[PDB]
Structure formats: structure tokens, C-alpha cells
Amino acid sequence: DLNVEIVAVERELWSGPATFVFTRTTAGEIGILPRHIPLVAQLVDDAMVRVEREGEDDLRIAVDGGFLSVTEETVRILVENAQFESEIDADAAKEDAASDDERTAAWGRARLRALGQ
Amino acid sequence: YRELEAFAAFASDLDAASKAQLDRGARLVELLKQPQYSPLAVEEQVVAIF
Amino acid sequence: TLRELRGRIRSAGSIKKITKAQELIATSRIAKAQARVEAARPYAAEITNMLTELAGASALDHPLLVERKQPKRAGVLVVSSDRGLCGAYNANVLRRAEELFSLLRDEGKDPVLYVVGRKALGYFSFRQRTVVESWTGFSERPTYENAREIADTLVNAFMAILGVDELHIVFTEFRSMLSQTAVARRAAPMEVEYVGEYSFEPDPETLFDALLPRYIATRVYAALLEAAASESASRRRAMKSATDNADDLIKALTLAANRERQAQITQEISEIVGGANAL
Amino acid sequence: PAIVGDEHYRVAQEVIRILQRYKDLQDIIAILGIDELSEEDKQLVNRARRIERFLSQNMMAAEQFTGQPGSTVPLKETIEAFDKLTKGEFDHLPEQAFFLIGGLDDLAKKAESL
């Protein structure tokens, strides 16, 4: 099973094991299952992450301009700021998605995508 | 040394010269320390302060 | 005189109470800030690791890694507190900043200020030195957003707009609880550190270029966190010193007030018995 | 000023102003130290400490106690030195450089030694 850890710059955000991880890197969409070759990539500005947690349901995360690393030991998602699907404010994300600012608009669109649109 | 020890009690760092002075002063103070009813002849004091 | 002494002994007691409270609150906030500093260590370590891998795979021609041909200006990010009672914290930071400015002039570089914290703004405004940009109100509780903004401004100045050909950061490193030392680090251009001895998407040149600004941002964030921890430690030390000084001043004023109390009693008795002897 | 001259009077009164402001701050300096003062008072306090230590002199009668020979400072040199100190032309030297020194030449000599 994958050792999936999501590390925000301020703090470590999540550390549960998973069977499958999914995200849109800058050069296309990618999925990682255990024993994937080492990799480094940049998640799209409005990226989202799906972690197929083995025990419970999958975890959908809105990620802000994060980086993805795959290693023989663990799968790391470095994050500037991220939110689990349960913590997303749907109305706030909808409002931000129309924001003029590129960063705010991208973050809101990422929140919408993680939530389930 | 007394003044510098008062200063350094709360300073964040001590320079090489300051630390050397503090170390010398601590040993000088410990050297002047003397037990009661144990006076020292003047030559013994000369050697001790030396 | 006795009334003045008792009023002063009242003030000193109130000040002792306030400074002891501040010392204990600083002891708590030191723990909080140190916990935050540790909490950001994983991201710093992992981003540094992937940065080393990309640099191994990169060309190493990014602007942040190559010295400018002729350095004219050198930005300096001075990280200072925003509230007083922090002892010589701000003084040490600004002394190191001035030493850095002298070194820069000896190298021909013209320093240009970016200042974090209100106190450094006052220090530099008194000395008629212009701060291009200043950020305030988060030295106690820095977030990653403030570090992102600071790093973005610094990197934009470095790339450029008059711009700067180099940039340093002066801040109080939190070496240990007892000791916190003002240090200056050149945050750009970064030295390539070859040492004895993966896949990349898109190619390692673009990924490395998009990662390096993030590295500068995380290093600035770590600097801000460590400066906050050092500020809290310096506040603890300064408030312990203030409490000790207030206690010593209370003792001195109490000894005095006792002396004038006894002297007033004596003088009153002298007057009374002088009147008695004459009558 | 009618007797000692306007220069002497001005320097003396500026020194007195600096020392009086230092005395007024003394109560705060006792608790918190110079680090809490404003930067116009911090500068004033630094040069006030230097003025206070410069008023000291290696007296000729003090040789029997210290061994250091005495020094005499002419009035014009004293006025010049304190005019400089009040204007901040010496506020970068260490304070001990002004201690029991007696003059500007000796001030420079001791500064070096430190």
C-alpha cells in the first residue's frame, strides 16, 4: 500500500496510507498506485487530489499550487495550502471561482473541483 | 567582572573577549574566597594571587 | 518624600506584576513558536530534497543561481519585531543589518531596504533611510501568506523597475533557548553546492524554475518563524530582567520609605519633646 | 554668556540638557533599559552616557590611588570636545574610551587601544 503524506508548508496535513492517488499535474493527469517509479511534478494551479484510502471512502482535497513527489518509500504532496472536501465552503468557492485575481480564482476553482462541482 | 556578569546574565551572546573576562573573573572571585580562621602569610597570598 | 516613595513602590509593584505576566506569556509563546518552527520542517526538508534532485537534473542557469555581471544594488530584508519589550532583539537585528550595509558598501553594492516589523521602520525612518516596501503586524504569528508576499516582492526585485542584483535577509536565528543570534543569509543568488552522489514532468528545467521561487518562499517563511521564536525568547529574557529590576527597585524604595518613616517619627518626637522641655 | 562666551555657554547648556533628559529617563532605564526608548532618546541616552563618562578626568591628585598620571585639558579643548560629543561626532566609540581620559588626543588614543 502507498504511504501517502500531504505536507502543507505550515504543517503536515495528512499521513494516512492509501491504495491509489490521483491528480492533474502541469503536464497531464496522473494516477499513482504502490511501487510507482520515483517522480516529481507540479500540480496545476487549480488542481485537486483524490486519495483512494483503503479503509474508508476516498479523500478529495483542494490543493493550492502544490508539488507531487513519488518515492520508493512514500508519496508526498507538498502544498502551499489545501482543504479536505468536508471543510470546503461551497458558496465561498463558487464566489471565488469568478474572482478576477488569478490566484484567488484558481484556488476557488480547485475548491469546486475537489468538492464535486 | 561584576558589572560584566550582571550584563551577561540576560545578554543573548558573549564575545570571545567578554567570555574570557568572565572566566578569568569567576576564578579570581573563587581565588579570593577564603576559609575562616585560616589567615595566609603574605608570601602565600602573593603566590595565590599570582 | 514618604508619599512619593510609597507611590513609586506602588508603581513598581504593578510593573513587577505586569512584567512577570509578560514573562510567563512569553514562555508560553516560545513553546508555540518553536512548535510551529518544527511543524514546518517536513515541508522544508522535502522541498529541499526534490530541489536537489531537480538541480542534479537541471541545467543550473536559472537567474537565481547566477551572479549578475556587475552588482549595483543589494536588497536587504530586515526582520524585526512589531511590539517592544523584546530586549535587545531589534537592536541586535538592526546592528547586524548596519554591519551588512557597511560590508555591501565595501563591496560597492548599494543596499536597499525591505523591512518586516514596525520597530525597524522607526529605526530606519529616524536615520532617513528609505524602505521600498515594509510589512507589519505578523512578526508574532507569521503565516505562509506573509512569507509568500515577501518572497514574491524580493524575487521580483531581484529579476528586475530598478531592481536589485542581490538580496540578503537579516533575522534573529533561534539557535537555542538561551541564545538567539542575529544572522545575515544571502537568499539569492544561491550557490550551487556540488557534493558526492527519478523522473520529471514537465521537463526538469521548467519544474526547477517553478520550484525555486517556492524554495525562496519557504526559506523566508522559516526565517520569519525563527525570528518570531527568537522574539518571544528575547521577550521572556527582557521581562525576567524587568521583573528582577522591579523587585530590586521595590526593595530599594521600601528600604527608603522605612528610613523616612523612622526619620519622620524621630523628627516628630524631637519637635514634641523640644516643646515639652521648653514648657 | 556675557562672561564665559556664547560658545562655552551653548555647549554647557546642551550638555546639561542631555544629562537632564538622561536623568528623566533613568527611572525607565532602571526597569527596561535603553532598548525600550524612542530613537531620539536612545541616541540622546548613548551620548549622555558618553558625556557623563567624559566629564571624568584622571586627576593629578589621583595618581597615588590609580598610578595613572594626571592630565590637564585647556578650556578651549574642553569646549570643542563637548561640542563634538553633543553633536554626535564621537557616539560610535565605546563608552570606556571616555573614562578617565582627559582630552581629545587621549580620547583618540584610548579609543584605539580599545
Swiss-Prot record, chain A:
Keywords recorded for this protein, A-Z: ATP synthesis, Cell membrane, CF(1), Hydrogen ion transport, Ion transport, Membrane, Transport
NCBIfam families: ATP_synt_epsi (TIGR01216), PRK13442.1 (NF009977)
Subunit structure: F-type ATPases have 2 components, CF(1) - the catalytic core - and CF(0) - the membrane proton channel. CF(1) has five subunits: alpha(3), beta(3), gamma(1), delta(1), epsilon(1). CF(0) has three main subunits: a, b and c.
Lineage: Bacteria, Bacillati, Actinomycetota, Actinomycetes, Mycobacteriales
Disulfide topology: none
Membrane topology category: Peripheral membrane protein
Gene Ontology annotations for the cellular component aspect, listed alphabetically: plasma membrane; proton-transporting ATP synthase complex
Family recorded in the similarity comment: Belongs to the ATPase epsilon chain family.
Role of this protein: Produces ATP from ADP in the presence of a proton gradient across the membrane.
Location in the cell: Cell membrane
Principal localisation: membrane
Organism: Mycolicibacterium smegmatis (strain ATCC 700084 / mc(2)155) (Mycobacterium smegmatis)
Protein name: ATP synthase epsilon chain
Curated annotation (Swiss-Prot), chain B:
Localization per Swiss-Prot or TrEMBL: Cell membrane
Transmembrane segments: none
Source organism superkingdom: Bacteria
Cited function: Produces ATP from ADP in the presence of a proton gradient across the membrane. The alpha chain is a regulatory subunit.
Summary of subunit composition and partner proteins: F-type ATPases have 2 components, CF(1) - the catalytic core - and CF(0) - the membrane proton channel. CF(1) has five subunits: alpha(3), beta(3), gamma(1), delta(1), epsilon(1). CF(0) has three main subunits: a(1), b(2) and c(9-12). The alpha and beta chains form an alternating ring which encloses part of the gamma chain. CF(1) is attached to CF(0) by a central stalk formed by the gamma and epsilon chains, while a peripheral stalk is formed by the delta and b chains.
Family statement: Belongs to the ATPase alpha/beta chains family.
Protein name: ATP synthase subunit alpha
Organism: Mycolicibacterium smegmatis (strain ATCC 700084 / mc(2)155) (Mycobacterium smegmatis)
Gene name as annotated: atpA
Segment of the intact protein contained: 400 to 449 of 548
Curated annotation (Swiss-Prot), chain C:
Listed CDD domains: F1-ATPase_gamma
UniProtKB keywords: ATP synthesis, Cell membrane, CF(1), Hydrogen ion transport, Ion transport, Membrane, Transport
Membrane topology: Peripheral membrane protein
A cellular-component GO term for this protein: proton-transporting ATP synthase complex
Domain of life: Bacteria
Location in or out of the cell: Cell membrane
MF (Gene Ontology): ATP binding; proton-transporting ATP synthase activity, rotational mechanism
Gene Ontology process terms (BP): proton motive force-driven plasma membrane ATP synthesis
A Pfam family that the UniProt record links to this protein: ATP-synt
TM stretches of this protein: none
Assembly description: F-type ATPases have 2 components, CF(1) - the catalytic core - and CF(0) - the membrane proton channel. CF(1) has five subunits: alpha(3), beta(3), gamma(1), delta(1), epsilon(1). CF(0) has three main subunits: a, b and c.
Family of the protein in this entry: Belongs to the ATPase gamma chain family.
Primary role: Produces ATP from ADP in the presence of a proton gradient across the membrane. The gamma chain is believed to be important in regulating ATPase activity and the flow of protons through the CF(0) complex.
Protein name according to UniProt: ATP synthase gamma chain
Classification of source organism: Bacteria, Bacillati, Actinomycetota, Actinomycetes, Mycobacteriales
Swiss-Prot record, chain D:
Protein's job: Produces ATP from ADP in the presence of a proton gradient across the membrane. The catalytic sites are hosted primarily by the beta subunits.
Family: Belongs to the ATPase alpha/beta chains family.
Gene name per UniProt: atpD
Part of the intact protein present: 358 to 471 of 475
Organism in which the protein naturally occurs: Mycolicibacterium smegmatis (strain ATCC 700084 / mc(2)155)
Cellular compartment(s): Cell membrane
Disulfide cross-links: none
Lineage, broadest ranks: Bacteria, Bacillati, Actinomycetota, Actinomycetes, Mycobacteriales
Domain of life: Bacteria
Name used for this protein in its record: ATP synthase subunit beta
Subunit structure: F-type ATPases have 2 components, CF(1) - the catalytic core - and CF(0) - the membrane proton channel. CF(1) has five subunits: alpha(3), beta(3), gamma(1), delta(1), epsilon(1). CF(0) has three main subunits: a(1), b(2) and c(9-12). The alpha and beta chains form an alternating ring which encloses part of the gamma chain. CF(1) is attached to CF(0) by a central stalk formed by the gamma and epsilon chains, while a peripheral stalk is formed by the delta and b chains.
